[PDB]
Design a binder for this molecule. Structure first.
Ligand code: CHL
Ligand code: CLA
Ligand code: CLA
Ligand code: CLA
Ligand code: CLA
Ligand code: CLA
Ligand code: CLA
Ligand code: CLA
Ligand code: CLA
Ligand code: SQD
Lengths: 87, 143, 31, 94, 157, 80, 35, 215
């Protein structure tokens, strides 16, 4: 990157630009994980004014979506920098 | 006919990846020690500061903090690889002082020509009574 | 008849003098 | 240290063989604005002496005594406030 | 195949290691640009900056947690408390300077990671610490004073 | 800086010298024992006080004694 | 008690001013190099 | 050289080079650094000058029959609100003190504005300086006495003197509300020099390891 020595390569954007392509798939119930997360984000306040109360649907949706996104980001970075898992 | 061998600064150091148990700030303002030995092959040894290093084939130099660390490494080399080493004391100003093999002969072996320092010619119970040396900054063993 | 403020002030001043004597004795003992 | 190879000891460069490095220090005299720097060095003019800087600390000691004799009463501290009734005790005491 | 952990300045016999936390470019730049690591800047100015930051960040705790936090006059009481804390750490700095710098000795030189010789920080001297301590007092007291003003101003707060 | 002393009861077994972790003792010629050697402490400045030499002495009582005294940067075993 | 203001001044002096002064002086004296 | 009591032995550092040197400094406040001693003298002179001006004003207002000086703060009627007066005084005194600071940093003495020595009549000399120091010290004690008399007694500098002249044996400090405390001070001070002499006799004058107030 421009600063640091972060191994997060620019070509590795597929992590965060591909995880939504799979998290947007409907899961029968409700409409979709990302869809529900975005709807909650845009409805239960713009995650800045008041608050998501105590233990709301938005909390679990945000935690699950971020869990998947972070795991995909880190695992993909490891795999891409490992070059076909050469370690 | 023995003279203290001079310390060569061109001696390479053993292959080590680094550790947090090495020299600190005391070596910059007080002193540190250097142990130099000769190995017939490149082999893995245990360092007194933690971890494992690889001594090269030929001359090896290692800088440690205390003299006890150097002596422990020398003991390991003598009892494991049958390698003899030399220990020196280096000061920040740049003075090197020979140590351990003082007269080229190990202390456990009599050399006939050393100083018989601190050797009382009496028994342990033949020392002066503490009441007989009162008001004197000395213990009964120094009489 | 409770002790008045002037009595407390006098006692404090006498204590100050006593403390001065004490510090002098301590200095003499240090030597 | 002459660490061009595997030598980390050098009597002619003993300064580098003991790890005497600044690590993060950097000398640079171009940073603070001249007008603001002058104001601060001027404000802390004579306050650079041990006796004078201790005098500033002595002011804090006076403030401590001032609080007890005035500040504590102005903040309505419970110890400096009044007291309401009392109790008798276990038996016929006070 | 890359090894992000290396010995300090290539020397593997020094009690330190270079990790992406200590030798990181951004981390190194930010840490080197602090007023404490300015060998060429006057100790008084660096002390003023350090005191300003410390004094400003030291009001908050007493404001929201002091014994009189539930009273409208909490801001003033806390401003005074921070001033007292700054004066205390001020005498601490003076005592440290008077004890640490009281003698002279031919110390070893100082070089950079590359091997470029640099003079010792002027802050590590009898007069250097005194100037730094004086700046810390002015900055520390000013920071506490500014902490009270921010409470009165700052439309959001 | 501890005080290390050697007494004539020594038999010159050289065990104390081998047990010293800082090289403080050494064997010098003598004529009071069958081994014709006595122990000595020429480098007491490097003595740490571990008393390992006493744990190795076989004479009764001990022929080598260590009296702990003024502590220094070397006697305290400090590497910092 | 007579002079109720005295404790409010003596308690902080003996518990805050005197201890700080004594500790600072003791710290400066036990590390003088040449007393 | 006269001292602060007959036969007093001045400290070693109080040889007598400075003016008004009576060998008085039991706490040894200026026995370490000479620069600190110079600053102490400058502060003493400043306090003395302010004391002389204050004493002169207080006495003048009392002789013309004006009200009490301590109560005169609330008996002043004129324009300019209190806050305005405070601001004007703070600004003018800030500039005056800055000029005085520069004067002390240059010539080592006081001054008035840009004038470093400020002596239009050229009446500067070592003999005239001693007069200023002694007069300032006397004025400082005079102001201290004014405040003390206003607190203990309910009179002013002239009224207190008149009351004492009316009955010197019954109108003194030892007969006021602070007489007891005063009786404890004199009795101690009366034996202070003699006790010091004992120290100079049994112990001698070979200096001491420490100083009362180090600072
Ligand atoms: C510089 C020294 C100085 C001193 C020693 C005094 C002393 C005093 N002033 Mg004062 N003043 C001083 C400067 C000034 N005063 C005033 C304006 C006033 C006013 C308006 C009043 C006093 C009053 C008083 C008295 C009571 C104050 C009090 O309650 O104090 C607590 C501590 C008195 C003791 C009061 C007075 O006279 O009460 C009878 C009063 O009303 N002063 C100004 C103009 C801004 C000053 C400027 O320097
Ligand atoms: C859900 C996210 C996810 C997961 C589970 C995986 C998993 C895997 N990836 Mg992958 N990767 C991802 C995202 C992910 N990737 C993304 C977003 C990218 C785009 C940059 C990549 C790019 C990438 C490359 C280029 C490569 C891999 C490879 C691999 C395989 C070996 C790496 C490994 O960590 O061993 C296994 C991990 C586990 C066994 C985890 C244990 C499972 C639970 C916790 C128990 C592995 C099965 C390598 C491969 O050879 O594929 C077969 C390889 O070449 N990945
Ligand atoms: C033995 C003497 C002693 C004395 C006289 C005090 C006195 C005080 N303590 Mg303290 N304390 C002591 C010992 C002492 N403590 C010890 C030994 C401990 C460790 C167990 C503590 C731990 C402690 C804590 C954790 C706290 C106090 C607090 C306080 C203050 C009470 C709250 C208040 O009045 O509002 C505020 C006080 C003021 C407005 C006056 C103080 C500021 C003065 C004027 C300094 C002037 C300097 C000026 C800025 C220049 C008060 C001034 C509370 C506090 O408010 O902190 C200050 C509080 O948080 N104390
Ligand atoms: C809750 C905080 C608080 C409040 C509301 C007040 C309020 C007041 N103080 Mg006060 N003060 C405080 C804290 C506070 N003080 C503290 C922490 C200290 C210790 C440094 C002092 C020391 C102090 C002194 C020495 C004096 C006052 C005085 C006064 C009164 C005149 C205003 C003034 O000049 O202030 C300042 C006023 C009613 C003056 C007064 O005459 O009271 C009537 C006065 O002389 N205060
Ligand atoms: C117990 C810890 C603590 C507490 C109670 C506070 C409390 C406070 N801080 Mg604070 N702060 C802290 C730690 C703390 N801080 C730390 C550790 C730092 C970093 C060193 C900061 C740096 C900081 C800054 C930069 C600012 C505050 C500010 C504030 C105030 C704004 C609160 C608000 O209205 O919203 C508040 C009283 C703001 C303020 O206005 O200061 C009064 C402000 O801008 N704080
Ligand atoms: C760790 C335990 C602990 C904690 C959290 C507290 C907390 C508190 N005490 Mg308390 N106290 C304790 C132990 C503790 N006490 C003990 C053991 C005693 C008995 C000896 C007391 C006796 C006591 C008294 C008598 C009083 C208190 C009071 C208080 C309150 C105000 C004190 C204050 O503002 O200080 C100042 C706080 C600071 C100066 C902030 C320092 C901490 C900062 C936030 C550290 C931040 C580090 C930061 C994260 C670094 C990161 C790096 C950076 C780059 C980001 C406060 C909530 C007062 C009160 O009235 O209670 C309401 C009070 O009167 N305490
Ligand atoms: C050893 C005897 C002794 C002890 C244990 C105490 C204890 C106490 N006194 Mg007290 N006092 C004493 C003697 C003593 N006093 C004497 C003889 C006098 C007459 C002058 C006084 C006059 C006095 C007043 C006017 C007040 C106290 C107060 C107090 C309380 C708070 C302390 C304080 O800040 O006041 C300060 C105390 C003094 C200024 C004078 C004490 C001087 C003593 C004699 C020093 C003794 C030192 C000791 C022998 C050496 C031990 C070594 C040690 C210092 C490390 C405290 C419980 C305050 C109070 O009532 O709290 C509510 C208060 O206002 N005392
Ligand atoms: C330290 C020097 C000093 C100070 C602080 C004061 C301060 C004061 N004087 Mg004063 N005065 C002084 C020296 C001083 N004087 C001298 C040396 C003289 C002799 C010339 C006078 C003669 C004098 C008179 C005649 C009067 C004052 C008055 C006053 C008061 C109001 C002054 C005014 O209205 O605005 C400035 C004021 C508190 C007035 C007063 O007493 O108010 C009732 C007033 O009548 N002064
Ligand atoms: C220039 C110094 C000076 C002078 C000339 C006077 C003169 C006078 N004072 Mg005074 N006084 C002074 C300083 C001075 N005082 C100081 C510094 C204080 C603070 C402790 C006091 C506190 C004081 C009180 C409480 C009282 C007087 C009273 C008096 C009047 C006579 C009664 C008496 O016992 O005297 C004062 C006795 C003293 C021990 C005060 C100290 C005198 C010094 C050492 C001056 C020495 C003479 C000088 C070198 C010439 C008298 C006109 C009394 C009064 O008002 O009459 C009704 C009264 O009750 N004084
Ligand atoms: C109980 C005892 C109380 C003792 C009180 C001591 C007070 C300190 C003192 O006297 O210092 C004496 C020194 C002597 O300096 C000297 O000042 C001299 C000039 S003059 O004499 O002051 O004019 C100068 O020549 C000389 O170089 C210099 O050393 O004077 C100063 O420089 C003090 C100036 C203090 C300015 C800073 C105040 C705090 C600022 C806070 C900022 C934010 C606040 C909101």
């Amino acid at each position: 990157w421009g600063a640091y020595e972060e191994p997060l390569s620019l070509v590795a954007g597929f992590l965060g630009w591909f995880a939504p392509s799979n998290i947007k798939v409907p899961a029968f119930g409700n409409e979709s994980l990302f869809g529900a997360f975005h709807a909650s984000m845009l409805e239960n306040l713009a995650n800045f004014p008041q608050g998501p109360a105590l233990t709301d649907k938005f909390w679990i949706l945000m935690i699950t979506w971020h869990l998947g996104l972070f795991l995909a980001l880190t695992l993909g970075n490891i795999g891409q920098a490992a070059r076909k898992q050469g370690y | 006919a023995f003279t203290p061998p001079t310390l060569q600064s061109d001696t390479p150091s053993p292959i080590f990846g680094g550790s947090t148990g090495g020299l600190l700030s005391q070596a910059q303002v007080e002193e540190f020690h250097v142990i130099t030995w000769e190995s017939k092959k490149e082999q893995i040894f245990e360092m007194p500061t933690g971890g494992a290093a690889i001594m090269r084939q030929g001359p090896n130099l290692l800088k440690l903090a205390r003299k006890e660390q150097c002596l422990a490494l020398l003991t390991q080399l003598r009892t494991k690889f049958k390698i003899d080493g030399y220990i020196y004391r280096v000061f920040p100003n740049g003075e090197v002082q020979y140590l351990h093999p003082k007269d080229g002969v190990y202390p456990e072996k009599v050399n006939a020509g050393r100083s018989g320092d601190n050797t009382n010619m009496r028994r342990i119970g033949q020392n002066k009574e503490p009441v007989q040396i009162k008001f004197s900054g000395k213990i009964p063993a120094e009489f | 008849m409770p002790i008045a403020d002037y009595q407390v002030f006098t006692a404090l001043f006498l204590a100050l003098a006593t403390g001065i004597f004490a510090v002098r004795l301590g200095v003499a003992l240090y030597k | 240290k002459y660490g061009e190879e595997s030598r980390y000891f050098d009597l002619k460069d003993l300064e580098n063989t003991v790890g005497s490095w600044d690590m993060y220090g950097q000398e640079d005299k171009s940073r603070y604005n001249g007008l603001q720097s002058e104001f601060f060095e001027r404000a802390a003019n004579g306050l650079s002496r041990r006796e004078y800087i201790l005098g500033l600390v002595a002011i804090g000691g006076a403030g401590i005594l001032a609080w007890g004799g005035k500040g504590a009463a102005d903040v309505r501290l419970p110890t400096v406030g009044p007291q309401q009734p009392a109790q008798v005790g276990p038996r016929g005491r006070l | 195949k890359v090894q992000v952990v290396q010995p300090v300045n290539g020397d593997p016999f020094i009690g330190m290691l270079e990790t992406p936390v200590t030798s990181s470019p951004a981390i190194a730049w930010y840490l080197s640009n602090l007023p404490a690591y300015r060998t060429g800047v006057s100790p008084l100015l660096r002390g003023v900056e350090i005191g300003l930051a410390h004094g400003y960040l030291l009001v908050g705790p007493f404001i929201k947690l002091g014994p009189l936090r539930d009273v409208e006059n909490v801001a003033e009481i806390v401003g005074c408390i921070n001033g007292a804390a700054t004066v205390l750490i001020l005498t601490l700095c003076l005592a440290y300077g008077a004890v640490t710098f009281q003698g002279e000795g031919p110390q070893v030189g100082v070089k950079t990671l590359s091997g470029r010789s640099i003079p010792r920080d002027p802050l590590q001297s009898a007069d250097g610490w005194n100037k730094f301590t004086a700046g810390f007092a002015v900055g520390g007291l000013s920071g506490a004073a500014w902490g009270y003003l921010c409470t009165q101003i700052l439309p959001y707060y | 800086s501890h005080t290390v002393k050697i007494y004539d009861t020594c038999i010159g077994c050289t065990q104390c010298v081998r047990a010293c972790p800082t090289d403080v003792l050494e064997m010098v010629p003598w004529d009071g024992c069958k081994a014709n050697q006595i122990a000595s402490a020429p480098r007491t400045e490097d003595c740490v006080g571990c008393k390992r030499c006493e744990s190795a002495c076989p004479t009764d009582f001990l022929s080598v004694r260590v009296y702990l005294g003024s502590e220094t940067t070397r006697s305290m075993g400090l590497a910092y | 008690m007579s002079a109720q203001f005295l404790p409010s001044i003596l308690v902080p002096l003996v518990g805050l001013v005197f201890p700080a002064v004594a500790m600072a002086s003791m710290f400066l004296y036990i590390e003088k190099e040449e007393i | 050289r006269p001292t602060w009591y007959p036969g007093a032995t001045p400290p070693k550092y109080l040889d007598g080079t400075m003016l008004g040197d009576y060998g008085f400094d039991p706490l040894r406040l200026g026995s370490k650094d000479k620069d600190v001693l110079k600053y102490y003298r400058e502060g003493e002179l400043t306090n003395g000058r302010w004391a002389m001006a204050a004493v002169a004003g207080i006495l003048f207002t009392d002789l013309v029959g004006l009200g009490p000086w301590w109560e005169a703060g609330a008996k002043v009627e004129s324009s300019f609100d209190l806050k305005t007066l405070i601001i004007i005084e703070v600004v003018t005194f800030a500039i005056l003190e800055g000029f005085r600071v520069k004067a002390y940093e240059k010539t080592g003495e006081t001054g008035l504005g840009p004038f470093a020595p400020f002596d239009p009549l050229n009446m500067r000399s070592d003999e005239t300086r001693l007069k200023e120091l002694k007069n300032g010290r006397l004025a400082m004690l005079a102001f201290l006495g004014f405040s003390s008399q206003a607190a203990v007694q309910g009179k002013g500098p002239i009224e207190c003197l008149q009351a004492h002249l009316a009955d010197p044996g019954h109108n003194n400090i030892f007969t006021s509300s602070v007489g007891n405390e005063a009786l404890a001070a004199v009795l101690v001070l009366s034996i202070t020099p003699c006790l010091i002499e004992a120290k100079n006799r049994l112990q001698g004058t070979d200096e001491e390891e420490f100083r009362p107030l180090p600072w």
